[model samples]
Target: MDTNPCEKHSCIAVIDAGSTGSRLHIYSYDTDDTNTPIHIEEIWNKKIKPGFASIQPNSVTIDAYLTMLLADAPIHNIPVYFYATAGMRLLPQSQQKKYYDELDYWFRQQSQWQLVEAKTITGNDEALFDWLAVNYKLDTLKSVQNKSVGVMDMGGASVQIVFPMPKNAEISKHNQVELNIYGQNINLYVHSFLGLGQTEMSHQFLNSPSCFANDYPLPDGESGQGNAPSCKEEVTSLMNSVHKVNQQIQPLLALNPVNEWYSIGGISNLASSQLFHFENSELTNQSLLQQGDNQICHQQWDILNGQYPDDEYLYQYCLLSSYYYALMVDGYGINPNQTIHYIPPEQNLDWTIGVVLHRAL
Candidate 1:
């Protein structure tokens, strides 16, 4: 009796069906090694106008995209997995199901592909992935004690937060690795706060009271501390909601008493300069200036400190890193025996070419 069932020529396509655009990543298996579970030889990604596009991605669009992706691949005979994100989740129930049905039919008809829908990762899931990715990438920093880390990922439509800890501390023994990885101490508090994103924040929360209403009594301006005629009570209400959420999360940190909090996502970049203003202030009775309230601005500082690679290079690096990290979590070794070529045409290319590649494989 053979216990381990293995197959060859398997390909996994992770499709990031997002709000502004949709992305497709094709991963082909190259070898078999328990130490290096599976190697993805080449990956092709393309962004499509997502959301309820004037015309949705029917068989034609998907077919066109896959045709372009396989233009240089060794063969298209391998099995492929399709994963859809936010876009599918946001579609109207009837239309969304119809789209999936059409997509399914298309995949079955063309390339004999298998489609997987990744529509359930809540705001918390996004937050957790960002946290896990950041922590995995930054684990080298000795200063980060692993005591308590606040992971924040701000995305196109929402924000996610994850608090990770070991199992023994969960009142009862929660010997489960909450985020689905190794490490004895692997319990996590995860949740997604919707509508608190960069675009959402800038358009709705920034000037609104929710952005700053809780920590202070609404500054002493003619705004009159939430009493002025034009003072935004709605904004304040929302900010209070955010603050309440934060307050709930605060107690979860009491056990570890985190020394620093790390921030990521799009907003982190735009709001880095103003982050200090919030961090420097007191959170209700809790001051970030106090012993355990410090936060390091990765968006503002870390992003700017380096040699500063170009935008395209940086984006490619992030995509590669993200996929690489994903594979690593499955205990796969990234082999250099094969070469993956990324070609960005002159019209599509933006940013420098300097990059970072981890040789941990």
Candidate 2:
């Protein structure tokens, strides 16, 4: 007879209600001597597009979408966490409340699934989870490494940066998280920049001349000139002058230098695209922009589109290439030659894993 692992191990479901879509992940984990999660494994996962916040709050729509998202789950009797992120944050409280009310009603109708919590998580909270998820996967949480590890998670509506740092009274209380895991105390500096993510940032500069491939038409009736340096400078203004990303992040990073960097999100998609050259699942900002300027920015739109017919996001490669440099080099004050390792997009390693390991409210 075959045995079901979940019967002997703790199990839970996590649904990430992100800006672009909603993803469901089911995990089973065994507890350590100190109740810390160990031997964690993801058993099932599913994702549906058109994010939760994008739908109207009516009962019919909400019910249909919820059923479509959750009814097919292989296991239903687990405690489920449905946490919405920056997508819902863009909505006013009143608007957000309506969606939650409908979601509450939907959960009440379900018998097998237990709804632990359904709410929007702040960027600060998301940052800590992002950090935890990466480190846990890297197996650095319980073990001490010679060099400190830093993590960055860039989603559609927000971007997060987190690294090890001793708690300081000078920093904002909310931006830092102190965790005791495996009987070890861990202090981290975590910050997330809202509206600086690829989707949100693109909406602001869709008409900019230097951000797209040459001859690509902008919404403003101008053809893109496609210059990486010029586009990066424009993006830097939004990062530094507007969002003040430099003022908050640069000083802190300089004080607590990260020896290794890991990133997840649209960065992975861009870096892995056929138009660029990167090795060992890592990239340097300088090489990224240079290749963008030469391969993507200089290429004509029609030729480029025909060359990669299946690449849906091909149009934005030039812009994304420049934006990354703007955010990492200009905003965070990282050296352009420094490497940033990205998890392969196929792994689908998201913050939901953190919820599985930590099980926090």
C-alpha lDDT values of all predictions? 0.37, 0.89
Can you list the residue pairs that collide in candidate 2? Answer: none
| Residue 136, candidate 1: alpha-carbon lDDT | 50
Candidate 2's TM-score reads: 0.97
RMSD of each: 13.8, 1.4
Poorest 10 consecutive residues of model 2 by lDDT? 1-10
Candidate 1 lDDT, 124-225, residue by residue in tens: 444445555455544522233535665545455555555665554544332123543322234566655554433343444223332231222223331111
How many backbone overlaps does candidate 1 show?
8
Candidate 2 wrong stretches, greater than 4 Å:
1-3
lDDT score, candidate 2, position 331: 94
lDDT of 2 by residue, 1-361 (tens): 1157678788898999999999998888888777777888888899998999999889999899889999998788999999999999999999999999999999998799999999998888788889889988898888666788999998999999999999999888999989777667889998889899899999988999899999998887999889999999999999999999999999999999999999988889888888888989999999999999999988899899999997899989899999999999999988999999999989877888777766642
Judged by lDDT against the true structure, how good is candidate 1?
Answer: 0.37
Q: Estimate each model's TM-score.
A: 0.51, 0.97
